[PDB]
Amino acid sequence: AVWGHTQLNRLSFLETVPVVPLRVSDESSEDRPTWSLPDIENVAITHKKPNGLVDTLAYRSVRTCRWLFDTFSLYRFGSITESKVISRCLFLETVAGVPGMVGGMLRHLSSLRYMTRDKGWINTLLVEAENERMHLMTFIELRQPGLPLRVSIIITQAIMYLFLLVAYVISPRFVHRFVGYLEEEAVITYTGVMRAIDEGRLRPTKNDVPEVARVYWNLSKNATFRDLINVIRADEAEHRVVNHTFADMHEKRLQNSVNPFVVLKKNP
Amino acid sequence: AVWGHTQLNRLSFLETVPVVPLRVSDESSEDRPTWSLPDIENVAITHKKPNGLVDTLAYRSVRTCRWLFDTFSLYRFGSITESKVISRCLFLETVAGVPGMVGGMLRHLSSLRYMTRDKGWINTLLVEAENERMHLMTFIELRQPGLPLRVSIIITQAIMYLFLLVAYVISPRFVHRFVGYLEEEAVITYTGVMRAIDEGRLRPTKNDVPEVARVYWNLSKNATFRDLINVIRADEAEHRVVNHTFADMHEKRLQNSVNPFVVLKKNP
Ligand SMILES: Cc1cc(O)ccc1C(=O)OCCCCCCCCCCCCCC[PH](c1ccccc1)(c1ccccc1)c1ccccn1
Ligand SMILES: [Fe+3]
Ligand SMILES: [Fe+3]
Ligand SMILES: [O-]
Ligand SMILES: [O-]
Structure with missing residues (x-):
């Protein structure tokens, strides 16, 4: 490590900015999903029974939202394509990148002012927040969107x-x-x-899987479009449980407990 | 670790919170400081020149805030003591937590809304915000603050x-x-x-170092109160340069250029 007092005693590294590479492995934190595709091949659909008015309210927001989106996106009118898949999925990660961030930060500020230990909830919500971003940079590559969708993003994020x-x-x-x-x-x-x-029923034509994604998910050089999805979907299922476990931890007043998942990914 | 479809498919992990240990490492990301004590020994006091009004004004705004906080915290009143110091810093780290955070959180939303690479800022600030939050997490473990101070912190927090x-x-x-x-x-x-x-002039008694400090900063179990202030001093010296470096890039219409520390911390 060549990181020390000489470098710490400097005023700027503006000097050095025109000689440092744009390496696509510096995009994210050194904190990546590490999957294996035979195994994440068998992620299944699930569902959690609603307990109170809250889990119910939640569920109605999330079904009501869908219906509306499916109709304003025109998405289930006519056949599928690759346009509409990528489009839905690009838009939607813009919104997905947020929750974990507003939660991640709240726990941060909440820690700071009460001077209480956070027992590891923050980082997970932060490294989620990154993940779902990283899906969006990945989807950036396969299809750039016209002004229309670039706008709807802005006004939506504002609201969301x-x-x-x-x-x-x-x-x-x-x-x-x-x-x-x-x-x-x-x-x-x-x-x-x-x-x-x-x-x-659909022809992947991006069987050149983006560089960004390759380094992010550590896929081999010959990965297909399906191979992308399967690692996105695995990440999407990780949150499915993690944010349900967290919603459950609240229900029974465990917001001050240790985030199980820091141990459940390092283990005995 | 064993973290695959089978966990992902199990619905919640509420069941397990009574059986996960509370391991001091897990409080923080794995993305920690890694100083060498005699190197950081020669961390030195530096003062960068203001460029414009903005720079000069920002510089007044700190010196007014120091002149205020010192007199009003009675700090300027005779001899240095161990406790008025821990009181001093404890307070200061509860604010020092915030701007690293709002920084990541504002660049992040921009990234998701304009659909663009961040190029390694978001995560470098977010750890800064954690590093300070950890300084806190150490300091609190040297002295519990009284309600008059618990109250000043919670008001400060919002105003800031x-x-x-x-x-x-x-x-x-x-x-x-x-x-x-x-x-x-x-x-x-x-x-x-x-x-x-x-x-x-200071002969301190907390020469036990709290275990949040030792795993976070990788110090020996026989590190002193000097040593701990010295890595913190280091940590802060890291933060000193980066934000002058960032402002400078911002001055030189270079916002969206790769953050140049993702290499200057990593290059093998
Ligand atoms: C809050 C606190 C004060 C201290 O002096 C010392 C420690 C703490 C503390 O809990 O440490 C902070 C731990 C990190 C999480 C921040 C939690 C502090 C805010 C919530 C404490 C009250 C318990 C939740 C009641 P909230 C709630 C939400 C989820 C589950 C259960 C309860 C509620 C319930 C019914 C009616 C009205 C409100 C709630 C209210 C306010 C803000 C957020 N959520
Ligand atoms: Fe998503
Ligand atoms: Fe998602
Ligand atoms: O998604
Ligand atoms: O500070």
Whole structure:
């Protein structure tokens, strides 16, 4: 390590900015999903029974939202394509990148002012927030969108930021649960797509899988489009449980407990 | 670890929170400091020049905040003591947590809304916000603060949070400059403290170091109160440069250029 007091005693490294590479492995934190595709081949669709008015409210937000989206996206009118898959999935990660961020931060500030230990919830919500971004940079590559969709993103994030921000204030049981179902709805989408290839109801023409994604998911150089999905969907299922476990931890007043999943990924 | 479809497919993990241990490592990301004590020994006090109004103004805004906070915290009143110091820093780290955070959280939303690579900023600031939050997490473990101080912290937090937030949106350079110029003082103060220990005016009793500190900073189980202030001094010296470096890039219409520390920390 050549990181020390000489470098710390400097005023700037603006000097050095025109001689440092744009390496696509510096995009993310050194904190990557490590899957294996035979195994994540068998991620299944699930569903969690709603307990109270909150899990119910959550569920209705998330079904009502879908219906509307499916109709304003025109998505289930006529056949499928690769346009509409990528489009839905690009738009939607813009919104997906947020919750974990407004939650991640809230736990941060909440720690700081009460000077209480966070027992590991923050980073997970932060490294989610990154993940779902990373899906969006990946989807950036396969298809760039016209102004129309670039706008809808802005005005939507504007809205979805705020809502989340104040829901996560009031009942971050509402919000951790609300995510839970959004991941359940997604982990469908991404199977239905993995089952579309299989058969031949859709022709992947991006069997050059983006560089960004290759380094991010550590896929071998000959990965297909399906191979992308399967690792996105696995990540999407990780949150499905994690934000349901978190919504459950709230239900029974365990917001101050240790985030199980820091141990459940390192283990004995 | 064993983290595959079978966990992903099991619905919640509420069941397991009574059986997960509370391991001090897990409080923080794995993305920690890694100093060498005699290297960091020669962390030195530096003062970068203001360029424009923005730089000069941000620099006044720190010196006014130091003049205020010192007199009003009675700090300027005779002899250095161990406890008025831990009180000092404890407070300061509860704010030092915030701007690293709003920084990541604002660049992140931009990334998702304009669909663009971040190129390694988001994560470098987010660890800064964690590093300070960890300083805190150590400091609190040296002294519990009283309600009059628990109360000042919770008021501060909002006034700052919403300061940093509107000032970020407005002018990130101003912030980064402001934080550069804040963290200069961070270095002044912690150096001087070690100038009290090496010497005599301070003869501290907390020469146990809390275990949040030792796993986070990788120190021996026989590290001193000097040593701990010295890595913190290091940590703060890291933060000092980066934010002056960031503001500078922002000054030189270079916002979206790769963050140049993702190499200067990594290059093998
Ligand atoms: C809160 C606190 C104060 C101290 O002096 C010391 C420690 C703590 C503390 O809990 O440490 C912070 C731990 C990190 C998480 C931040 C939690 C602090 C805010 C919530 C504490 C109250 C318990 C949740 C009641 P919230 C709730 C949400 C989910 C599950 C259960 C309860 C609620 C319920 C019914 C009616 C109205 C509100 C709620 C209210 C306010 C903000 C967020 N959520
Ligand atoms: Fe997603
Ligand atoms: Fe998702
Ligand atoms: O998704
Ligand atoms: O600080």
